[PDB]
């Protein structure tokens, strides 16, 4: 049995290792529904996602055992809640695999649990990055947003500030991803690859694999910082939705013809932008506070936030 390639096949599903290709495809296909389903998922009715995955899985190579056992499952209690089962609604989906015949003595069930949790977190981040990216694509391509001589107040207070805060959010999100994937994930896969060389004891192999996984889990960026990130995600979700609405909202602000209309709309838009911005300033400052309060992520994440 070729253990090495089976481990790599598992990783490409559960760590994203050399597979961001796949995550991009998955999100770009199903984001339009995954964005809204997670409000009232008690009554499942999620036939479309299951059916679509069933169809797409037929296309893949049959000479990969692992992709075949990929199943879509859901549950109710959320991510911080499912971590509350580890040390005591955004994307509460799940992937699991029932490891094959009792050669799976190599691969436990606890390890599958932690792999599940990890993939859940990765998909959260990738979803938010995909939103920001679609937003950037919208801000610089739809002619509605191009400047053709409107009013110095609207730029000072609507569009320029919108762009500034959008770029701030995107920089922060990408920085979080950069820290996590670069100084968190490659350590484990690199150790696992090196222990494949000169192998002497199976039990040490099992111990090293689980040690790498646990060392992934121990990071407080998954446990202690996480409510900050969820409040972050609420803010960014709402802002991105607002901008997606602005794409057509801006259409009625120019030479209806400023006819005692949209003036309070302009004022409310200004206040909305201002309040969202100030909220995000406070939240980043508190994130700074917890960063400074107590892993090369130090002087790595904080560079893009620390205000000049």
């Amino acid at each position: 049995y070729d253990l090495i390639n089976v481990l790599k096949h598992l990783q490409q599903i559960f760590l994203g290792y050399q597979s961001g290709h796949n995550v991009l495809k998955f999100l770009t296909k199903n984001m339009g529904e995954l964005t809204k389903h997670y409000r009232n998922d008690n009554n499942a009715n999620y036939d479309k996602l299951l059916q679509n995955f069933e169809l797409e899985r037929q296309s893949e190579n049959p000479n990969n055992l692992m992709r075949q056992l990929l199943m879509i499952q859901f549950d109710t209690e959320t991510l911080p809640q499912v971590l509350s089962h580890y040390l005591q609604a955004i994307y509460h989906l799940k992937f699991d695999i029932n490891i094959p015949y009792p050669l799976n003595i190599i691969i436990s069930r606890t390890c599958m649990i932690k792999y599940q949790i990890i993939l859940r977190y990765q998909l959260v981040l990738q979803y938010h990055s995909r939103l920001l990216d679609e937003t950037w694509m919208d801000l610089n391509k739809t002619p509605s947003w191009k400047y053709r001589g409107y009013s110095h107040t609207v730029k000072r207070r609507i569009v320029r500030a919108t762009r500034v805060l959008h770029a701030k959010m995107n920089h922060f999100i990408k920085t979080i991803m950069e820290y996590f994937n670069q100084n968190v994930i490659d350590k484990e896969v690199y150790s696992l690859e090196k222990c494949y060389r000169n192998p002497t004891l199976a039990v040490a192999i099992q111990n090293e694999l689980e040690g790498g996984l646990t060392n992934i889990m121990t990071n407080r960026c998954l446990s202690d910082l996480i409510p900050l990130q969820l409040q972050i995600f609420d803010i960014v979700y709402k802002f991105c939705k607002f901008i997606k609405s602005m794409r057509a909202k801006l259409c009625q602000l120019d030479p209806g013809y400023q006819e005692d209309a949209a003036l309070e709309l302009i004022q409310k838009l200004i206040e909305y932008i201002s309040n969202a911005s100030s909220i995000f300033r406070k939240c980043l400052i508190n994130f700074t506070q917890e960063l400074s309060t107590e892993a090369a992520g130090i002087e790595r994440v904080l560079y893009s936030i620390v205000p000049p």
Partner: protein, 388 residues
């Protein structure tokens, strides 16, 4: 021992497929007794209308033999009887009547049967003289639906005839014009009945029988193929994916035969198919597990067959009505335009009867749907919802 077992089971499966036509008798039983391939049943009823309704006894069995002859001749199943290779199949069909009474209860007791012989009579579970005759229970339970279908079709045609007939009156007494409206509205009533029938039938033939038959053929067929995927995998109803068998080495040279079914597995799987059909909540009659529902307190099949009988009386009375319209046209088109029309009195009487029966029908059906919603089971709940 291992080698001999493997070899003998393999040769046995091969001979069953190749000499005695297994898997052709199974599909034949589904296409004959379990009501599939309906055109055969349609042609049978059409060619046996004169006899299924004969109000007599000591019936000429010879005509029924001619009936099965021309029935298998008319349907698509002639493609079997024409071929020498599998001609043996058609020989097994036969028809029976049991006389517990005089009055054309033959239509109520017409039974299609299929007699088996060695070796197959040993492998397949059929109307054994000391069995439960499950095939017979199913076949009667669906023959009811088929009686409804036949009568409704005939009389729908006679209806459309008669409405088209009265359309050429408008230079006459508008009372006859009234007929039009009434008949047209009356027609909708009939359809509200008939459609309901079909709904349930479809569920029966597409959610009880067919799904089970597909599972039986899938299990019996999996032995036939070669590895289109090298993972002998099982897909479940809960999304569970399990790999049984041994994860074999990938043809590794470290140093310098698959599972088909014996006879008992064959009989076992056929019996599983049948009993799992008859353990479904739309067939069970007499156990402790005959759980009755709120608002009725009755078994589902009992109330349902009551509904179907009510449907039958509706068909009879609507037949009478259309008859009445026919002789009204007959007397109207001729000389006597001073025509006595106590026939109209009968017309109104029969409308009153029809509307009474229809109100009773809707009431019973509402009880029925509420009963299924009380049941709470997903498929029965969806059947209840679909009926609305």
């Amino acid at each position: 021992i291992n080698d001999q077992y493997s070899e003998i089971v393999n040769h046995t499966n091969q001979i069953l497929n190749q000499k005695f036509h297994y898997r052709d008798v199974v599909f034949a039983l589904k296409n004959i007794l379990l009501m599939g391939k309906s055109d055969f049943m349609d042609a049978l009823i059409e060619k046996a209308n004169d006899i299924l309704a004969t109000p007599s006894d000591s019936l000429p069995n010879y005509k029924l033999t001619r009936v099965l002859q021309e029935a298998v001749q008319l349907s698509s199943l002639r493609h079997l009887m024409n071929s020498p290779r599998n001609s043996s199949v058609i020989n097994g069909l036969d028809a029976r009547v049991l006389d517990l009474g005089h009055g054309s209860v033959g239509w109520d007791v017409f039974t299609l049967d299929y007699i088996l012989y060695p070796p197959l009579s040993l492998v397949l579970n059929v109307n054994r003289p000391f069995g439960r005759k499950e095939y017979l229970r199913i076949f009667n339970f669906l023959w009811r639906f088929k009686k409804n279908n036949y009568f409704y079709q005939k009389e729908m045609l006679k209806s459309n005839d008669i409405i088209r007939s009265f359309k050429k009156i408008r230079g006459y007494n508008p009372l006859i014009r009234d007929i039009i409206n009434k008949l047209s509205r009356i027609s909708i009533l009939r359809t509200q009945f008939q459609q309901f029938n079909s709904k349930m039938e479809s569920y029966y033939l597409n959610c009880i029988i067919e799904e089970n038959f597909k599972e039986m053929t899938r299990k019996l067929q999996r032995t036939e193929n070669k590895s289109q995927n090298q993972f002998d995998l099982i897909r479940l109803n809960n999304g569970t994916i399990e790999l049984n068998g041994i994860l074999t080495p990938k043809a590794e040279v470290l140093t310098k035969i698959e599972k088909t079914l014996n006879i008992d597995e064959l009989e076992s799987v056929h019996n599983t198919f049948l009993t799992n059909i008859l353990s479904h909540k739309l067939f069970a009659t007499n156990t402790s597990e005959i759980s009755v529902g709120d608002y009725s307190g009755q078994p589902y099949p009992t109330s349902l067959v009551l509904l179907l009988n009510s449907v039958y009386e509706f068909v009879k009375v609507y037949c009478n009505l259309n008859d009445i319209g026919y002789e009204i046209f007959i007397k109207m088109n001729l000389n006597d335009h001073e025509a006595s029309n106590g026939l109209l009195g009968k017309f109104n009487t029969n409308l009153k009867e029809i509307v009474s029966q229809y109100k009773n029908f809707k009431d019973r059906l509402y009880i029925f749907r509420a009963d299924l919603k009380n049941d709470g089971d997903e498929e029965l709940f969806l059947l209840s919802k679909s009926l609305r």
